[PDB]
Amino acid sequence: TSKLKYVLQDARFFLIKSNNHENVSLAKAKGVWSTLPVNEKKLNLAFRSARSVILIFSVRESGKFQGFARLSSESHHGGSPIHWVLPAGMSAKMLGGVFKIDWICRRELPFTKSAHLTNPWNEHKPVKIGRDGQEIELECGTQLCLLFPPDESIDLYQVIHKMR
DNA sequence: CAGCTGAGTCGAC
DNA sequence: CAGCTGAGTCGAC
DNA sequence: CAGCTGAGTCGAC
């Protein structure tokens, strides 16, 4: 995992929570993500200050993580629309900011396999606990990403090249 | 974003 | 007007 | 396939 550990060096980690499976599947297919404006501003500021910003995805009530990815841009408004399945009470403009993301792993990891990992930045609660945008301490987030099964469909050349 | 809440005075120093 | 924020899991019942 | 069943809330954290 030396290439994987390289991508994770000095990274900041954020839990991303989706209300539906459809938007995570579209995120994996198109390499983009959108979030509410508060978390959008948080991720934009993290992108500018951190070597890498890693998003760890978990569909609400699914009992698993669905993979993780690296932010490759700040959010962009006004591009070609992403046709998200809009959660209840949310409009398309609320998710108007579109981040480009490079997926590092698109495989699943059940919460049962992460039960030994606690986040010291969230009162040492298990890493499965949190709302959208919950930040995860460096070492806890690194170990979590290393728990995912290997994704043979991922080529880390491009993400590593744009980090040089 | 978009719907929501709340918007002190008075006196010592 | 400025300030705030929702796309948490889990046990009890 | 194709006929069938079932579609928790609330509060601590």
From Swiss-Prot:
Consequence recorded when altering residue 103 to D: Does not affect ability to influence alternative splice site selection
Annotated phenotype, changing residue 94 to A: Reduced binding to N6-methyladenosine (m6A)-containing RNAs
Resulting phenotype, residue 131 to F: Reduced binding affinity for N6-methyladenosine (m6A)-containing RNAs by 9-fold
Outcome reported for the amino acid change (mutating residue 131 to A): Reduced binding affinity for N6-methyladenosine (m6A)-containing RNAs by 100-fold
Reported impact of residue 18 to A: Does not affect ability to influence alternative splice site selection
Source organism superkingdom: Eukaryota
Modified residues (Phosphoserine): 80, 91
Residue ranges of domain YTH in the record: 11-148
Post-translational modification: Tyrosine phosphorylated.
Full-sequence range covered: 345 to 508 of 727
Documented effect of changing residue 67 to I: Abolishes RNA-binding and ability to influence alternative splice site selection
Domain-related comment: The YTH domain mediates RNA-binding.
Record protein name field: YTH domain-containing protein 1
Role, per record: Regulator of alternative splicing that specifically recognizes and binds N6-methyladenosine (m6A)-containing RNAs. M6A is a modification present at internal sites of mRNAs and some non-coding RNAs and plays a role in the efficiency of mRNA splicing, processing and stability. Acts as a key regulator of exon-inclusion or exon-skipping during alternative splicing via interaction with mRNA splicing factors SRSF3 and SRSF10.
Compartments (UniProt record): Nucleus; Nucleus speckle
Summary of subunit composition and partner proteins: Interacts with SRSF1. Interacts with SRSF2. Interacts with SRSF3. Interacts with SRSF7. Interacts with SRSF10. Interacts with CPSF6. Interacts with KHDRBS1/SAM68. Interacts with TRA2B. Interacts with KHDRBS3. Interacts with EMD. Interacts with RBMX. Interacts with ZCCHC8.
Entry binding sites for RNA: 17-19, 33-34, 84, 132
